[PDB]
């Protein structure tokens, strides 16, 4: 049994996030607790830029993220798409990545987000990258 359970309190938070009316760029960063075999909250930010988010993530361990991004378009229109990001850095321990890989689908299906992105370096997480990924 490698697949982790999801903390019930974290499940409530993710469920609330799906349809949130708040406009601030909130991020929920989640990790595996290897001992509990449980995906848990690590930290949550009320309002964080893609660069700031990039800076929080560990460079050499995996994390799951849900993120709200305020997207101001060329023409002034504003949208707030949400996405799920699996930070799976090349260089993480294979056993570590594997544990995260095995719980990703469960957590995605719990968050119920359809925009699911995987980055193999935290360098990739930029405003330009998000805008490309989020536009359709």
Curated annotation (Swiss-Prot):
It comes from the Eukaryota. PANTHER family: GLIA MATURATION FACTOR GAMMA, GLIAL FACTOR NATURATION FACTOR. Expressed predominantly in lung, heart and placenta. It comes from Homo sapiens. One of its GO terms (biological process) is protein phosphorylation. This is Glia maturation factor gamma. Keywords: Acetylation, Growth factor. Pfam families: Cofilin_ADF. Belongs to the actin-binding proteins ADF family. GMF subfamily. GO terms for cellular component: cortical actin cytoskeleton; extracellular region; ficolin-1-rich granule lumen; secretory granule lumen.
